[PDB]
Symmetry: D2
């Protein structure tokens, strides 16, 4: 029996690698994806072999991540519960996609991940796995073992020679998420110094910085006149937005499995892209199309948040969003200053910005008012 | 014939007052509402009499404005096309409501206003009027007169004794709007010094300021522990957020009459309230309720923007929003700093948050069954696709 | 330990009553609700006591069923996946509501039902139970026992001395549902003579029959001029519609649990009410209100179907639907003929219909301006396409 | 100048053709489209030349109508206000399309139609024309002439010389619409013998008739095993359904221009197609995709009804509906009997139905976990209410 483990190189997946070998008397193939966490994945791959993996794989997936998951999501204007730009949410389908592919190639009957039984990640990983390979076997150790606390887990790792290192973090090219520990009290502000991807607004440059972002067909293709690949472009905007402290959100969200959770997120590049997109859309999209689009975005957002990426509903809505986004061609000009992003200009080759006479308005108004006047007369 | 004119006190409504009297051989009753435009309404009232009004009425409607129009709208989370908090939009129904009221009291068969034929305000004024008094006659001079240019309008004014004087502004307790002129080029950043209600972030305090807003039943009732009436509360938050340069928006919007236009808005108090409201809702509203509510907010926003305030669709949706909003009770803690509003905390008497469920309602294993069932249709799809 | 069992009086809940006693060694309180199954619940109550119940309760809930469940649902125009009027769906919450009431009165820590692990009813019973009493314990024998076949169950019944006798059916005041067995093949028409509530259309009267239904406030209050209580009214329309074979539908629906299921339903009275309601609404509801209401109906429907009756989302939407329904006052005249229901007329005290607006409230030029304004964005669009 | 006139060959467009020759003294080009009105279109073309038309054109557009307009609409499951299948609505864009095409080919500056200023047709014609050629000049005689009454028009006709003859009719391959006259009273049943396309239910065969419709990637491609082109297929289903009296609807609808109107429609073929489609969808579409699609259908319906066919909103939604419809491949079996259509069977090569998931990937106990997790937020809510 072989098992493809989503291995991040940390303590838990290291413990998991050992636990899987003994518990399932299985050969474990480790997989570590480079999605912009800011770590040398090769070090994780080598730790996996030291830990006991029969094979360890590491892949640079930053470009596939931005082009095939982040970009399509952004085209939809996806925002969960008013603020969450879904940084962790869209990255999970990508990881599981490769787990299942590797499982196929290696002849493995199962896959494993270290997401807990109380979060969203477990759902995202498994819904994707099942959607792509229906008879795949999934093993989620957190829902199968009986560790009674951290102490017991550190003891288990020390016993296997696994080296042992106030909140939980998840970082990738789109954002860095923070939750748990001290963050659990929604009345308490995050502690100073917690953020890593964005500069503290109180420490941002004293002068504002202008940035231009070009969109061609619904996707951003250039920054300040320089054409950049998907991953390179997000990276650049992260650098630019980050220096100014842009993209910080603090919310109490509703998880898919039932409870509320306090989360903090920094999405510098994606936040600039959100406003840049809407800026270009303001000139290229039709009024009714836009209004219909905005009423569907929230639904799309929850699909991503819940884990229904490789699902027919999401694919169907994507057909609508992509259609609409094809008209988003132009340039947005933004002004960045101490934590904030300001749209300051926009232009487009086929802008709809700027015939009748005042007289037509009276008619328009009379007809629009008819049903209201009738209703009024009936009330008498 | 009597005509009740929505009189702002400026050049155009003064020109209109004289124009109406002669064109319609009627007497004009001028109505000026104080909705926080930062001017002395009694001066417009007196100017109306000097311009020829048979009667001039001026009313302080700040409290009614915020209590009966702004609060109801905020309750619904209304936001037009992603950023417009509807500052000018919700004020129009209030004005027209009083116009129709005064017309009935004065025995006036018609009402008038100085909104142009190419904007949204004309629709808001008239849809409200017709909805409240179906037989009312509406006179909109811009759509009727033969004035050809500004030059001629000035000559007419000067001939009639009316005193004469880079963009058009509309200010009230909720915001200040700027559009037209130099703002007509969507690629040009607005001019320096344009903003009035808010301080440029570059000049905002170096020290962030914490502000707490208490919501009792969907509406804000206190700021930093001090109980304030609707208008006093909005005023307070404009002062606080204004100093920090909060609430600035720059957008190209879609007008109801069919064309796009570049608008700039500063809504300090309203912006703080928008995020404060959502902060309290994050603890007091159910997941499914919240998601449904957010999908209807945009529709409600276009209704307000188009002018369908006193319309059945709007009142029906208001029943939904008011039901949901009744649960919004708690306190939001925000951090203001150079143009931004950061939510840093929230608490509520009946908060649905239980860290009991997040720290390390079921045991992990229940999650497996949940996933299996949720995945069934997807697995079936995959098997069929073979 | 005490366990309140939702007892229908059939073979399975009889086997379950025994099973609960043996498995848990608890006192079992059988509850049978009369919701129009066309069964004498007092027989079931007696059989329950014979089967071993420590206490058996039988309540007539026909009026509560229609008044507090069917009517609120009908006001929303709830229809699941194009054709399902939710007959079985709205009944479950009522039953679970009493199961928990009784458990609390008797001091029973648990409730039990005989819905299987493959369907929707399990979710409906349990979601309302947990929603009303969060610490209640639920026992669903179908998900806990070892019986591996029908034959095994019958033997267990005999070994326990319980009386023993091509599809499963569920009947109540709203409809009769048929699914399973021969019906599992979606390409096979239901067998002849299966329907029980409606007469076969080929055997229905040769002369159409006219019926009028009065609505006052969103709910039906009279049939052919006779005031009738909710349950009596639904009963009456079932008699009238059934005689004509009205209300039959055949669909393959999506269960909440993931798979498709072939179901057949007969809802005579409800079908008449569905069309009668829309008929009165056509004169009493505003265009925009109607269009908005219709786009929310499908959502409310899935909530009911899934089992989210005592859920904040449903109660929120209910506030909207109730608000809109308050105007539905008038009379619908329908024609019934061999399985079909035809709306032939409608009237209302405050009908918004006006023949003068259509007979050959504005002049022709108004329409021209309306069209021009509506066309503006389309023309700018074509011009840019150039 | 040149004017292209949408000419139906009837009294009014004949009067309109003269009116155009006299008033504008222009060269009128008549255009008559054959879209299944069952009216020898060539008769209409000769009469146009006989009336002063310097050129009359007649085209067989039946196939284009069904393939490019009816099918895309049905693909979306479009239904206006619960019953209207949009028969007249989708035909108008097709006509205006050719008018504008012919105007470009004839160097004509304007186009004209005889829809009145009180209905929706004028909007459909004009929105289509403006969207296709923003520069186009439109002339709507009903809104421009001085005639008051039939008497007046009648004499004017005799005068110039035009043959001269209870409700108004509009017929095409999809349906026949009836409204006006005796139909204006919402309480008055339609007059016996009014219907033309459908046999009276009471006069329909005593024996039910089964029919099968095959769908391929969203569109009907065969009936009872015989492959038929779009127009031939709709024609065939009209014949089969008509003989049984299928597809009759009687409603009071909300017109786009503001007033309610009583309309009667018979859509035999289209009605069979509506139920056949949903039947194939019940096996080929995913639950969540279906539920989403149905909540959007109504919006697409009003877009068609209002006249926004060649509009970005409609084309955008079309991309969604087209994507979803591509999966609709299979066969539906329906039973026709005296005015009703009953789905009795359905099958598909890629059916998502699995008898094994329902008969006695699925484990009963997974349902408990599913239920507990779904119940969590409801339990927390209840506990907080203490
Ligand atoms: N970059 C990655 N490549 C492969 N799998 C990943 C990757 N990142 C996260 N995962 C999966 O996600 C789980 C991580 O959830 P997370 O909250 O980040 O926990 P963790 O405590 O950091 N794991 P570890 O780093 O081994 O201590 C891991 O158990 C992995 O299965
Ligand atoms: N506070 C108010 N009281 C009464 N009527 C008002 C008030 N504010 C605005 N209006 C109406 O709205 C129109 C104003 O449109 P707006 O763009 O503000 O023009 P204007 O510049 O104010 N007119 P004027 O100031 O008289 O030259 C006026 O013509 C009034 O009819
Ligand atoms: N009228 C009722 N009163 C109380 N409980 C009911 C009633 N009707 C249905 N139930 C509940 O619903 C379950 C019925 O599921 P169903 O598929 O109809 O099975 P069943 O065949 O009726 N059981 P039985 O009649 O005992 O053989 C029962 O187990 C009850 O818990
Ligand atoms: N088959 C067609 N070909 C071209 N234009 C048409 C056609 N059918 C309808 N129209 C247009 O639609 C208008 C008809 O509206 P309708 O209510 O059918 O009136 P009408 O009574 O049929 N006109 P007429 O037949 O000339 O007496 C006509 O003025 C035409 O411009
Ligand atoms: N494994 C993690 N640390 N992920 C944190 C959760 C991210 C965020 N709560 C989400 O639902 O996307
Ligand atoms: N009279 C005015 N200055 N009105 C300004 C328009 C405000 C904004 N464009 C709106 O439509 O609400
Ligand atoms: N116990 C029963 N036989 N129930 C009938 C099932 C009813 C229908 N399929 C529903 O899900 O509501
Ligand atoms: N030309 C006609 N008589 N058309 C009848 C209008 C049909 C239907 N009421 C509609 O709005 O489409």
């Amino acid at each position: 029996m072989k098992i493809v483990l989503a291995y991040s190189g940390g303590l838990d997946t290291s413990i998991i690698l050992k636990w899987l070998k003994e518990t399932y008397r299985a050969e474990v193939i480790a997989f570590t994806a480079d999605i912009g966490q800011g770590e040398e994945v090769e070090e994780a791959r080598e730790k996996a072999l030291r830990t006991g993996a029969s094979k360890a794989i590491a892949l640079d997936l930053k470009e596939e991540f931005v082009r095939d998951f982040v970009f399509p999501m952004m085209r939809a204007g996806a925002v969960y519960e008013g603020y969450y730009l879904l940084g962790t949410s869209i990255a999970r389908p990508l990881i599981a996609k490769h787990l299942v592919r590797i499982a196929e190639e290696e002849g493995a009957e199962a896959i494993a991940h270290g997401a807990t039984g109380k979060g969203n990640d477990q759902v995202r990983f498994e819904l994707t796995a099942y959607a792509l390979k229906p008879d795949i076997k999934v093993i989620a150790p957190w829902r199968e073992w009986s560790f009674q606390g951290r102490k017991e887990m550190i003891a288990y790792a020390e016993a296997h020679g696994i080296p042992v290192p106030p909140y939980s973090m998840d970082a990738n090219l789109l954002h860095i998420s923070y939750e748990g520990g001290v963050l659990e009290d929604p009345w308490a502000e995050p502690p100073k110094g917690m953020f890593r991807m964005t500069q503290d607004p109180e420490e941002a440059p004293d002068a504002p910085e202008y940035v231009e972002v070009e969109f061609f067909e619904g996707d951003p293709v250039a920054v300040n006149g320089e054409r950049l690949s998907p991953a390179a472009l997000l990276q650049r905007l992260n650098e630019i937005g980050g220096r100014h402290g842009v993209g910080r959100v603090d919310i109490v969200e509703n998880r898919f499995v039932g409870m509320k959770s306090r989360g903090v997120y920094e999405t510098p590049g994606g936040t600039i892209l959100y406003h840049a997109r809407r800026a270009v859309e303001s000139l290229t999209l039709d009024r009714e199309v836009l209004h219909q689009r905005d009423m569907l975005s929230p639904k799309y957002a929850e699909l991503v948040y819940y884990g229904f990426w490789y699902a027919p509903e999401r694919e169907a809505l994507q057909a609508y969003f992509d259609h609409v986004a094809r008209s988003v061609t132009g340039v947005a000009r933004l002004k960045l200053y101490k934590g904030n992003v300001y749209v300051v200009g926009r232009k487009a080759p086929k802008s709809l910005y700027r015939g009748y006479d005042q007289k037509d308005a009276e008619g328009f108004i009379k007809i629009q008012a008819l049903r209201l006047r009738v209703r009024a007369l009936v009330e008498r």
